[PDB]
Amino acid sequence: RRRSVQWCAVSQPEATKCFQWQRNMRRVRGPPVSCIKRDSPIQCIQAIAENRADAVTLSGGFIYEAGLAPYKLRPVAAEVYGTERQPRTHYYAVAVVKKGGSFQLNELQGLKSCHTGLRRTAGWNVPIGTLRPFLNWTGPPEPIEAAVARFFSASCVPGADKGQFPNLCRLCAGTGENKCAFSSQEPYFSYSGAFKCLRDGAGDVAFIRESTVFEDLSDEAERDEYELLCPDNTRKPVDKFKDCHLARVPSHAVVARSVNGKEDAIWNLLRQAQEKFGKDKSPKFQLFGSPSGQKDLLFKDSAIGFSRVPPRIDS
Ligand SMILES: [Fe+3]
């Protein structure tokens, strides 16, 4: 009757990490963590709601959905970014382009775009929300995806309906059924996939977060080959994100059942994993690190930890 916290992995790579997370947790004598493999965030959201798993980290994009019936999941902990000396539970949504180009934010029409994924914050909600006016979209019933698949010549918005909006998956590098998948099986998936999409030359603009270029480039010189599109219709060097970003957004978060959620145990698991497996904590396992050729598995790579979401009873 050992009922540990059961984590929901989306895709094989994530599964694998969870399992590694598990043996190391056992190794160091911390609370145990078990692993359930799902295929999509939604598949996870469901499992959790039906007691087949207890937790999963979601992008600020899905948090709202997950909280509605019949799901009713509620965030228990938020990811923490920044550095130890300065930590934050927010990040910046920016648009990165190659330096050398003329176009400004208001001149994206007809260009090729790279997004982290459908419904995520920096990769979709913010940019699209901002480009709204230029989209000439005649509200619902017509899907915003429709309006966007006609504003950019081609894109890669992992998770998008390939059959309806084939334009939105045109640039995606996934093989077969994984092309445009909202999973690590799709190489242009997530911040780094989106940025890779720009670096590989598939798109002209990448909607990602402020640290990507910093996290991704082995040579600091190479950062110079890129720049940011600011909202005043100017371009600034990559480190100017504090003065050139589309929005400041809250961090990704761990969600759980509003009822019988095991919040206390989840929290305990996290607090311990972070102490043992956080940044530069162990040569054996990094909770916030992903293998070569995968990224942001389970948690945001290079995040620094978690912050407990205040107490709730009314929910
Ligand atoms: Fe995000």
Residue type, 44: C
Centre of ligand 1 from the C-alpha of residue 91, in Å: 8
Centre of ligand 1 from the C-alpha of residue 123, in Å: 7
- Which residue's entry shows tokens 């990490």? 17
- Given CATH 3.40.190.10, say whether it is the number of domain 1-80+253-315: yes
Distance (Å, whole) CA 148 – CA 168: 8
With left for phi above 0 and alpha for psi between -120 and 50, is residue 69 left, alpha or beta?
A: beta
Question: Nearest Cα to 65, choosing from 88, 95, 40?
Answer: 40
φ and ψ of 168, to 5 deg:
-70, -10
Question: Nearest Cα to 203, choosing from 157, 241, 155?
Answer: 155
Omega prior to 143 cis, within 30 of 0: no
Q: Say if residues 73 and 51 touch (Cβ distance below 8 Å).
A: no
Q: How was this structure determined?
A: X-ray
Distance (Å, whole) CA 214 – CA 220: 8
DSSP 94-155: EEEEEBTB---GGG-TT-EEEES-TT-IIIIIHHHHHHHHHH----TTS-HHHHHHTTSSEE
Centre of ligand 1 from the C-alpha of residue 198, in Å: 18
Q: Which residues contact residue 220 at a Cβ distance below 8 angstroms, ignoring those fewer than 6 apart?
A: none
The DSSP bridge partners found for residue 115 are 207
The packing angle between helices 263-277 and 12-27, to 10°, is: 80
Q: Say if residues 96 and 195 touch (Cβ distance below 8 Å).
A: yes
- Biggest distance spanned by C-alpha atoms of the chain: 63
- In the chain, where does the domain assigned CATH 3.40.190.10 lie? 1-80+253-315, 81-252
Distance (Å, whole) CA 43 – CA 40: 5
Q: Which residues are identified as catalytic?
A: 72, 258
User: What does the block give as tokens for 63?
Assistant: 């948090």
Centre of ligand 1 from the C-alpha of residue 119, in Å: 10
Centre of ligand 1 from the C-alpha of residue 27, in Å: 32
With left for phi above 0 and alpha for psi between -120 and 50, is residue 268 left, alpha or beta?
A: alpha
Centre of ligand 1 from the C-alpha of residue 63, in Å: 11
Centre of ligand 1 from the C-alpha of residue 10, in Å: 16
Distance (Å, whole) CA 81 – CA 78: 10
Resolution of the experimental model, in Å, one decimal: 2.0
Q: How far is CA 185 from CA 159, 197, 204, 307, in A?
A: 11, 14, 22, 29
First vs last C-alpha separation in the chain: 29
Residue type, 86: Q
Distance (Å, whole) CA 194 – CA 116: 5
Other beta carbons less than 10 A from residue 240's beta carbon: 16
Q: How far is CA 63 from CA 56, 58, 67, 182, 274, in A?
A: 11, 6, 6, 16, 22
CATH class of the domain at 81-252: alpha beta
Burial class (CB in 10 A: 0-12, 13-18, 19+), 268: middle
